[PDB]
Amino acid sequence: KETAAAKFERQHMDSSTSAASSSNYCNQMMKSRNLTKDRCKPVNTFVHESLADVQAVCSQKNVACKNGQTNCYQSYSTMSITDCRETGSSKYPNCAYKTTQANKHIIVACEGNPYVPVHFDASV
Predict the structure, then answer these.
(1) Residue 37 annotated in ligand binding
(2) Is 85 annotated as a binding residue?
């Protein structure tokens, strides 16, 4: 099985580009990050910043998570991100996604020692 931290990295980190490179970015990334294996994961966000900058968010603005948990943190700065969302033509096993690039604050939930991101809650 995957550690919670490693799963966050697999699902949410893309430090290799500064932004989504094409409208097919999400189709390519959801596949290669193994998010279309058993089914199409409906919604997923990738963050185009260094792993260090994303981990640092766990020391930034403490805010509530959407479910009311107290261990969420909002980035003080905006970050380059890409929202991937299933589109009408999508149907497992042929997953299809819309790519939406944006620059926003991210909100993540953190856990553990070291205290690192384990869930992507939202972006604002």
Answers:
(1) no
(2) yes
